[PDB]
């Protein structure tokens, strides 16, 4: 029975990983659940999995759950604050920690797990996008095992040889016969759209997606391919890949989740349904397998699988992400931050769809790059890029 702490349990990934536990009760034991304010969900999960501890980052939210679970006859101890969240990730008896908390938060909670040398089911982008170098140095030193939950990175992991999986980010690709990592993406809803028309696309149009049913922020990132840009930054740190060892491909049907090109010409790939329980269950059971409740892929009910090379004129955000990587963590962190601001501004109809790539670029052009030396430095670059971006949005919505 693997002991696990779930960081961000009430979210989509959180509830999904919990469903995998349901399907395999004798395989996993929930030791701790961590969340933000969604007391309701927390209550249900605690009542179902009898966690030893439960924490909410919000003091108030924590008080309600504190008593709500008291009366419910629950014997789970309720705590609160980041400090507590971080302790849950470092519990002596916990084997794995699902790091599903997003944004700047979750950075310290995930780092806490890495420093405790635990197995980390990496389900957040912030870690590698903003602290790529710092986190990979920490995992190497603390000997923690990273197991990527993100569909693409997970497909890549499953398609890699054992020696790289066990020394992720440290092992050399070439020495292990890998020539490159093939990062795949759908290309979004504007894959065919004339370039001239991108500037007038609306939020509803941008958030139009077939495959995965993600939120609006991620749907837009998929339309600009900033999402793939961020996964590119992540992949290089995670798999120890140079620019020439990375290949980005458009695969509209999203059946293949990503692949790995080898020395003898072999290309290994992972295919599946657009259901996160698969990659989640894979990381949870690794190196073994477990039922995830996901229905088997029916090859007789598929659209023809196609591929294409992305055009940077169409996806400038993709190229921006690639360039930001060469500039360091300050750059990628700033790009990520600006993008959060611009996508939100676009969604609020304050700027055009094409203003996202334009403002993201402009923010990076004005930032004073100073490579962070710890997460606190990273957080400062984030806050600073976030402010620079808000002003560009206001400057654009006002007069400029």
Ligand X SMILES: O=CN(O)CCCP(=O)(O)O
Among 13, 46, 114, 324, binds ligand NDP (CB under 6 A): 13
Among 38, 61, 110, 151, binds ligand X (CB under 6 A): 151
Is 53 within 8 Å of 26 (Cβ atoms)?
A: no
Q: Is 211 annotated for ligand binding?
A: no
Q: Is 336 in the site for ligand X (CB under 6 A)?
A: no
What is the spatial distance between Cα 32 and Cα 78, in angstroms, rounded to a whole number? 10
Among 96, 119, 254, 333, binds ligand X (CB under 6 A): 254
Identify the DSSP state of 61. Answer: H
Q: Is 318 in the site for ligand NDP (CB under 6 A)?
A: no
Q: How far is CA 371 from CA 134, 365, 384, in A?
A: 11, 15, 14
Q: Is 257 annotated for ligand binding?
A: no
Token pair, residue 175, equals 């020495």
Identify the DSSP state of 308. Answer: B
Strands 77-80 and 53-56: parallel
Q: Which of residues 158-187 bind ligand X (CB under 6 A)?
A: 185-186
36 binds, among ligand NDP, ligand X, a second copy, none (CB under 5 to 8 A by kind): ligand NDP
Q: Which of residues 44-103 bind ligand NDP (CB under 6 A)?
A: 57, 85, 100-102
Among 57, 126, 150, 340, binds Mg ion (CB under 5 A): 150
What is the spatial distance between Cα 112 and Cα 161, in angstroms, rounded to a whole number? 28
Q: Any residues with CB less than 8 A from the CB of 68 and at least 6 apart, and which?
A: 39, 43
* In the block, residue with structure tokens 């990527």: 148
35 binds, among a second copy, ligand X, ligand NDP, none (CB under 5 to 8 A by kind): ligand NDP
- Residues across the chain: 400
Q: Is 159 in the site for a second copy (CB under 8 A)?
A: yes
Question: Which stretch, 123-131, 157-165, 316-324, 345-353, contacts ligand NDP (CB under 6 A)?
Answer: 123-131
Among 150, 340, 355, 392, binds ligand X (CB under 6 A): 150
Kindly report the number of other CB atoms within 10 A of residue 165's CB atom: 16
Q: Is 96 in the site for a second copy (CB under 8 A)?
A: no
Q: How far is CA 121 from CA 30, 320, 374, in A?
A: 14, 28, 22
228 - beta bridge partners? none
- Contact residues toward Mg ion (CB under 5 A) are 150-151
- Contact residues toward ligand X (CB under 6 A) are 150-152, 185-186, 188, 211-212, 214, 222, 227-228, 254
Binding residues for 1-deoxy-D-xylulose 5-phosphate: 125, 151-152, 186, 209, 222, 227-228, 231
């Amino acid at each position: 029975g693997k002991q696990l702490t779930i960081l961000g349990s009430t979210g989509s990934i959180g509830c999904s990983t919990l469903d995998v536990v349901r399907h395999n009760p004798e395989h996993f034991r929930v030791v701790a659940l961590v969340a933000g304010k969604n007391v309701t969900r927390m209550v249900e999960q605690c009542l179902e999995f009898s966690p030893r501890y439960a924490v909410m980052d919000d003091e108030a939210s924590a008080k309600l759950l504190k008593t709500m679970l008291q009366q419910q006859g629950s014997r789970t101890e309720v705590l609160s604050g980041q400090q507590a969240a971080c302790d849950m990730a470092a519990l002596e008896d916990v084997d794995q920690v699902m790091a599903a908390i997003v944004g700047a938060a979750g950075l310290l909670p995930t780092l806490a797990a890495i420093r405790a040398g635990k197995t980390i089911l990496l389900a957040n982008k912030e870690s590698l996008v903003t602290c790529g170098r710092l986190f990979m140095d920490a995992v190497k030193q603390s000997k923690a095992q990273l197991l990527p939950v993100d569909s693409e990175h997970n497909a890549i992991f499953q398609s890699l040889p054992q020696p790289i999986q066990h020394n992720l980010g440290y092992a050399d690709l070439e020495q292990n016969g890998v020539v490159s990592i093939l990062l795949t993406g759908s290309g979004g809803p504007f894959r065919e759209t004339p370039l001239r028309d991108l500037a007038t696309m609306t939020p509803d149009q941008a958030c139009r997606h077939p495959n995965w049913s993600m939120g609006r922020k991620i749907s837009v990132d998929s339309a600009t391919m900033m999402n793939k840009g961020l996964e590119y930054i992540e992949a290089r740190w995670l798999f120890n890949a140079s620019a020439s060892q990375m290949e980005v491909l458009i695969h509209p049907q999203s059946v293949i989740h990503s692949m790995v090109r080898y020395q003898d010409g072999s290309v290994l790939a992972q295919l599946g349904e657009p259901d996160m329980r698969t990659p989640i269950a894979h990381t949870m059971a690794w190196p073994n397998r477990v039922n995830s409740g996901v229905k088997p892929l029916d090859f007789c009910k598929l659209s023809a699988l196609t591929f294409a090379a992305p055009d940077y004129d169409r996806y400038p955000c993709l190229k921006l992400a690639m360039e930001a990587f060469e500039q360091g963590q300050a750059a990628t962190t700033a790009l990520n931050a600006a993008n959060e601001i611009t996508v939100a501004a676009f969604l609020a109809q304050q700027i055009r769809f094409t203003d996202i790539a334009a403002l993201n670029l402009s923010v990076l052009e004005k930032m004073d790059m100073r490579e962070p030396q710890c997460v606190d430095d990273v957080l400062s670059v984030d806050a600073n890029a976030r402010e620079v971006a808000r002003k560009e949005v206001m400057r654009l919505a006002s007069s400029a």
